[PDB]
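Recap quiz, item 2
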Amino acid sequence: RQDYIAKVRYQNDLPAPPCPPKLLKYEIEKEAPQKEFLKDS
Amino acid sequence: YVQAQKQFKQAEDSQNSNTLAKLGYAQCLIARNEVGDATIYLEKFFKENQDSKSSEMMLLLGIIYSQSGKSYYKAII
């Protein structure tokens, strides 16, 4: 079958890991500061 | 903490209108690391007093629910 030459290859390639910047937990995200803040007089 | 919690409970039993006594009771529960017990007491008080304007109670409820995580919607409210 001498006709138009074309190659079909589906692209589903996974991207490389992004490694985005990491959020920093608040001081009130730790159990001990939470206890100190809630137990305030 | 045990004695203060007992005193807060006695204050509540003497006069139920003392919201400050109940809030101190919840704070003492927090002091004794009774996270679940304080949460149950706070839910009972809020559901009985949904119209009460205890801003600090609602702030504490939001903080507790955020620590829980699954109850984020009540925390937002």
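The two ends of chain A are 88 Å apart (CA to CA).
Chain A is about 20% helix and 0% strand.
End of item.
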